[PDB]
Design an enzyme around this catalytic site. Structure first.
Site, PDB file in Angstrom:
ATOM      1  CG  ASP A  57      -4.623  11.055  -1.356  1.00 45.40           C
ATOM      2  OD1 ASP A  57      -5.489  11.785  -0.833  1.00 45.40           O
ATOM      3  OD2 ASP A  57      -3.518  10.813  -0.823  1.00 45.40           O
ATOM      4  CB  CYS A  77     -13.170  16.195  11.077  1.00 42.54           C
ATOM      5  SG  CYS A  77     -12.806  16.442  12.839  1.00 42.54           S
ATOM      6  CG  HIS A  82       5.369 -22.494  17.742  1.00 42.17           C
ATOM      7  ND1 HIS A  82       6.515 -23.259  17.884  1.00 42.17           N
ATOM      8  CD2 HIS A  82       5.135 -22.304  16.427  1.00 42.17           C
ATOM      9  CE1 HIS A  82       6.926 -23.522  16.663  1.00 42.17           C
ATOM     10  NE2 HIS A  82       6.131 -22.965  15.755  1.00 42.17           N
ATOM     11  CD  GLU A 114       3.115 -22.431   9.346  1.00 40.91           C
ATOM     12  OE1 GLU A 114       2.266 -21.540   9.108  1.00 40.91           O
ATOM     13  OE2 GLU A 114       4.345 -22.233   9.256  1.00 40.91           O
TER      14      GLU A 114
HETATM   15  C1  LIG Z   1      -3.600   9.236  11.736  1.00 39.14           C
HETATM   16  C2  LIG Z   1      -4.469   9.715  12.619  1.00 39.14           C
HETATM   17  N1  LIG Z   1      -4.618   9.205  13.888  1.00 39.14           N
HETATM   18  O1  LIG Z   1      -5.638   9.951  14.580  1.00 39.14           O
HETATM   19  C3  LIG Z   1      -6.056  10.878  13.690  1.00 39.14           C
HETATM   20  C4  LIG Z   1      -7.125  11.760  14.228  1.00 39.14           C
HETATM   21  C5  LIG Z   1      -5.414  10.807  12.505  1.00 39.14           C
HETATM   22  C6  LIG Z   1      -5.611  11.668  11.296  1.00 39.14           C
HETATM   23  N2  LIG Z   1      -6.991  11.725  10.824  1.00 39.14           N
HETATM   24  C7  LIG Z   1      -7.751  12.855  10.770  1.00 39.14           C
HETATM   25  C8  LIG Z   1      -9.006  12.568  10.277  1.00 39.14           C
HETATM   26  C9  LIG Z   1     -10.085  13.493  10.076  1.00 39.14           C
HETATM   27  N3  LIG Z   1     -10.977  14.196   9.894  1.00 39.14           N
HETATM   28  C10 LIG Z   1      -9.046  11.165  10.000  1.00 39.14           C
HETATM   29  C11 LIG Z   1      -9.988  10.291   9.502  1.00 39.14           C
HETATM   30  C12 LIG Z   1      -9.686   8.941   9.367  1.00 39.14           C
HETATM   31  O2  LIG Z   1     -10.657   8.105   8.846  1.00 39.14           O
HETATM   32  C13 LIG Z   1     -11.328   7.183   9.666  1.00 39.14           C
HETATM   33  C14 LIG Z   1     -12.066   6.186   9.018  1.00 39.14           C
HETATM   34  C15 LIG Z   1     -12.758   5.238   9.753  1.00 39.14           C
HETATM   35  C16 LIG Z   1     -12.723   5.268  11.141  1.00 39.14           C
HETATM   36  N4  LIG Z   1     -13.471   4.245  11.816  1.00 39.14           N
HETATM   37  C17 LIG Z   1     -13.619   4.028  13.153  1.00 39.14           C
HETATM   38  O3  LIG Z   1     -13.094   4.730  14.005  1.00 39.14           O
HETATM   39  C18 LIG Z   1     -14.499   2.826  13.565  1.00 39.14           C
HETATM   40  C19 LIG Z   1     -15.992   3.171  13.470  1.00 39.14           C
HETATM   41  C20 LIG Z   1     -16.605   2.897  14.829  1.00 39.14           C
HETATM   42  C21 LIG Z   1     -15.600   1.978  15.500  1.00 39.14           C
HETATM   43  N5  LIG Z   1     -14.300   2.402  14.961  1.00 39.14           N
HETATM   44  C22 LIG Z   1     -11.987   6.261  11.781  1.00 39.14           C
HETATM   45  C23 LIG Z   1     -11.288   7.222  11.071  1.00 39.14           C
HETATM   46  C24 LIG Z   1      -8.432   8.451   9.704  1.00 39.14           C
HETATM   47  C25 LIG Z   1      -7.451   9.297  10.207  1.00 39.14           C
HETATM   48  C26 LIG Z   1      -7.764  10.653  10.355  1.00 39.14           C
HETATM   49  O1  LIG Z   2       7.011 -21.610   3.645  1.00 39.12           O
HETATM   50  P1  LIG Z   2       8.163 -22.273   4.360  1.00 39.12           P
HETATM   51  O2  LIG Z   2       9.496 -21.587   4.213  1.00 39.12           O
HETATM   52  O3  LIG Z   2       8.243 -23.760   4.116  1.00 39.12           O
HETATM   53  O4  LIG Z   2       7.774 -22.093   5.914  1.00 39.12           O
HETATM   54  C1  LIG Z   2       6.574 -22.639   6.468  1.00 39.12           C
HETATM   55  C2  LIG Z   2       7.004 -23.822   7.315  1.00 39.12           C
HETATM   56  O5  LIG Z   2       7.550 -23.379   8.562  1.00 39.12           O
HETATM   57  C3  LIG Z   2       7.190 -24.306   9.599  1.00 39.12           C
HETATM   58  O6  LIG Z   2       6.296 -23.635  10.498  1.00 39.12           O
HETATM   59  C4  LIG Z   2       8.436 -24.763  10.365  1.00 39.12           C
HETATM   60  O7  LIG Z   2       9.613 -24.771   9.544  1.00 39.12           O
HETATM   61  C5  LIG Z   2       6.451 -25.466   8.917  1.00 39.12           C
HETATM   62  O8  LIG Z   2       5.398 -25.993   9.742  1.00 39.12           O
HETATM   63  C6  LIG Z   2       5.918 -24.843   7.630  1.00 39.12           C
HETATM   64  O9  LIG Z   2       5.821 -25.800   6.566  1.00 39.12           O
END
Ligand SMILES: Cc1noc(C)c1Cn1cc(C#N)c2cc(Oc3ccc(NC(=O)[C@@H]4CCCN4)cc3)ccc21
Ligand SMILES: O=P(O)(O)OC[C@H]1O[C@](O)(CO)[C@@H](O)[C@@H]1O
Ligand SMILES: Cc1noc(C)c1Cn1cc(C#N)c2cc(Oc3ccc(NC(=O)[C@@H]4CCCN4)cc3)ccc21
Ligand SMILES: O=P(O)(O)OC[C@H]1O[C@](O)(CO)[C@@H](O)[C@@H]1O
EC number: 2.7.1.105
Lengths: 441, 441
Positions: free
Chosen positions: B121, B151, B250, B319
């Protein structure tokens, strides 16, 4: 309050439907028109057919509407590229009528037949034709997604003509040289008016994928939904590299001998003999590299162990779960659960075993297996009867109704070779006796 | 011949390992360096963090190496954009040293720590820097995959500075106006030497994705493998639109009252009270549109029925399968299966119930749920304790070890609001009594 009932076939909890004196039906998201774009011999029909095969298998009703087939129906015999000339006033009218007749059938399929996706397989090389398709989609409340195949390589074009164009019903009375020459002239008829998709300026608001140089590069614009995202992922996983897919079941197991379903039993003496026979068979295939996939059940792992090759276990390859009917014989199922037995016989694909699965559940589980099979080259899948039927239905384009009845005998390898139209299937029985687990409808 | 044993924790059939007198270990495919590319305030850190969160959750060990954090470590206090000037000889040397120190840690992570993916990064805006990263990848046998965010919208840039840049540790002693002004000048330092990825000519052989105009368009070049294909599919499913994710179990069921695991029991009287309370809560949220998802088990469907909203049943939300331990109390499990009980307590994530599942199996099943949750806007997921812990671990970036112990009480809604850093989590108890099903390590 909140009274539910479990549906007998699929085992789905539904609200108890105490329909009033006069029961009302409410009969019946937005369908999609996939628009193929590109010059002839660009793999549009190959993409159309493969994508349709995948979409149908995952449960999305899909159909291809090839404008050329409407033309072969309207025009009795094909003579030459002269039919495709831009100055051919009469044939241009006929070709437009054929495209409009295909769109009429697209409307009927999506709005009246319960179809979800219509693949409009034509050149659709001009902005005019595409504007007309868009108008048709907007007026019918259909989504439009464009798939363009772009390639300038003359080797790729010539290879496609030789592999699947010369063998077209249009070239029945022609020899390979005449057909190749006529097809090159036919491609040239389209080159002058060809306007590629321009997502930068003109086609900026269109939902599209540009497949460039046989999938070396992709231009993706405005993916609106889940199905378009899935298509894009599929196109990026498939390839046109030569390879072989070998599918088989584990060698005969102890449960097979007792006529018992499910379980995690080991190989019988015959099953061990098949495993050795499979190793010899695999060796005789002389494959440079081979990936071996098994389920997490003992019988498939023991079969792979005989190969002395690295293998990968997939929980997704495990046999269909029979729920309460696990480890029982079919006779014991009919006697303990007669209602369940009859329900399955009547609706084998959708039927879900109590606390178990359906063939429909198998498809959902096997989708990542299919996606990985597509990305791979030489693969040997050692699995189970129901799993094998499901995978085979994908490769052989078999319907949900046919799928639970496909013949997948024990000690038999299914060799799949991808040809230009789909898969060539060879069956290889490895000469080891076993019980028969096939049951007809 | 072909002797296998079933591993006690994961229940995997392995060849009986009769190690010789001197047992040999053989300790330990190619790791990947994901290279972020682009000007500052282009969401590179947002992409890095989100992608890492997803990859770790699906089981691919991933780590982010942010060059700016190495810089904040080497240089005690940040003063201004003057540090980022191209004519700043000293800071340019420091910044290069920081990038090389991050790459040193990338090598150690991938070659010595069992890491599979390293997300590098940084801006990596020059061909020179990228050639150096490629040399580093080739010499270490690492794959290189580039993710560029492009962009030109000044509204998007200004919004990103205001949302997450002004609050950066670099701008601690600065007010919003000073920090915004300094950051704009800081971006300008990078603009002159910025060479975008060119898959057409220069970067033709590189594996890359160009995210254009916050995901409106994508340029995909040479996707080599499964993980790159998956990243591309993920980037096409995620969005930056505002929305809310509500997660709950649930309402209390009959098995909960008896302390029984699994099964398909219906809502208790308290569970029905929660379902009504949930409807009132949902109504009070005043959401324009809301998708409601349930499992195929009765208790979640009965809870959704109280909402009087359309809902979708997912078998993937069912589950965790307890296999032979289904419908048993934990006391009955400890008394009938003491070895199994102790094995689970020791390794709760990887432990697989006999003929049942592990939390690890849940992740594999829930991956399509996560992918669809990403594509959606307002969603209410009515599920089960183990399913909820798994989904929550994805949204809250919790490890495999933490996941089986996350607190997910009955009759409590988890409200997830995507912020620029990840998810803001609000808990809403709907004031209906229930039993406690949480068990600590
Ligand atoms: C946080 C934050 N919230 O709004 C904004 C704006 C930001 C900051 N930001 C700025 C960006 C720039 N340039 C940017 C690109 C991103 O990369 C992307 C990668 C993939 C997609 N994909 C999609 O939108 C898919 C593709 C079509 C359907 N949806 C979008 C952004 C993700 C976040 C980005
Ligand atoms: O992984 P743990 O702690 O057993 O929890 C999952 C369990 O929880 C429940 O949803 C209810 O206790 C069970 O159906 C399931 O086995
Ligand atoms: C039959 C046949 N066998 O070899 C050739 C050549 C053909 C005929 N043909 C000609 C085409 C052209 N132009 C073409 C495009 C296709 O569309 C494609 C769509 C996606 C991908 N995707 C990939 O290759 C992915 C992307 C990166 C990893 N692998 C490839 C081709 C599929 C088949 C095509
Ligand atoms: O769908 P069918 O015809 O019952 O076949 C699937 C069955 O085949 C078997 O693999 C063996 O007969 C069983 O484990 C499984 O129940």
């Amino acid at each position: 309050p909140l009274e539910l009932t479990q549906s007998r076939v699929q085992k789905i909890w539904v609200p108890v439907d105490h329909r009033p004196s006069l029961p009302r039906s409410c009969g019946p998201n937005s369908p999609t028109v996939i628009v193929m774009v590109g010059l002839p011999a660009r793999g549009k029909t190959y993409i159309s057919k493969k994508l349709t095969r995948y979409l149908n298998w995952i449960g999305v009703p899909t159909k291809v509407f090839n404008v050329g087939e409407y033309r072969r129906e309207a025009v009795k015999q094909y003579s030459s590229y002269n039919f495709f000339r831009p100055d051919n006033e009469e044939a241009m009218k006929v070709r437009k009528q054929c495209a409009l007749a295909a769109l009429r059938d697209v409307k009927s399929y999506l709005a009246k037949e319960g179809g979800q996706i219509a693949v409009f397989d034509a050149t659709n090389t001009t902005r005019e034709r595409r504007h007309m398709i868009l108008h048709f989609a907007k007026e019918n409340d259909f989504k439009a997604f464009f798939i363009e195949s772009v390639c300038d390589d003359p080797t790729v074009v010539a290879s496609n003509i030789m592999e699947v164009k010369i063998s077209s019903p249009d070239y029945k009375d022609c020899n390979s040289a005449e057909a190749m020459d006529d097809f090159m002239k036919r491609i040239s008829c389209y080159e002058a008016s060809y306007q590629p998709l321009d997502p930068d300026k003109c086609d900026r608001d269109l939902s599209l994928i540009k497949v460039i140089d046989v999938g070396r590069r992709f231009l993706v614009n405005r993916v609106q939904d889940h199905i378009q995202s899935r298509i894009v992922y599929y196109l990026m996983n498939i390839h046109v590299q030569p390879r072989t897919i070998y599918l088989c079941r584990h060698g005969e197991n102890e449960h097979n001998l007792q006529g018992r379903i499910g379980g995690d039993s080991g190989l019988s003496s015959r099953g061990k003999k098949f495993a050795s026979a499979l190793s010899k068979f695999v060796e005789e295939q002389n494959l440079k590299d081979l990936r071996v996939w098994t389920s997490q059940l003992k019988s498939t792992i023991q079969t792979a162990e005989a190969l002395r090759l690295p293998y990968e276990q997939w929980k997704a390859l495990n046999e269909i779960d029979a729920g309460v009917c696990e480890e029982l014989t079919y006779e014991e199922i009919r006697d303990t659960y007669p209602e369940e037995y009859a329900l399955r016989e009547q609706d084998k694909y959708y039927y879900r075993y109590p606390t178990g699965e359906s063939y429909q559940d198998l498809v959902q589980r096997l989708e990542p297996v299919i996606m990985e099979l597509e990305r791979q080259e030489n693969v040997l899948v050692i699995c189970h009867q129901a799993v094998l039927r499901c995978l085979l239905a994908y490769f052989l384009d078999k319907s949900a109704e046919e799928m639970p009845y496909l013949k997948c005998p024990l000690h038999t390898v299914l060799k799949l070779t991808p040809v230009a139209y789909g898969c060539r299937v060879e069956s290889i029985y490895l000469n080891v006796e076993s019980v028969c687990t096939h049951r007809e409808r």
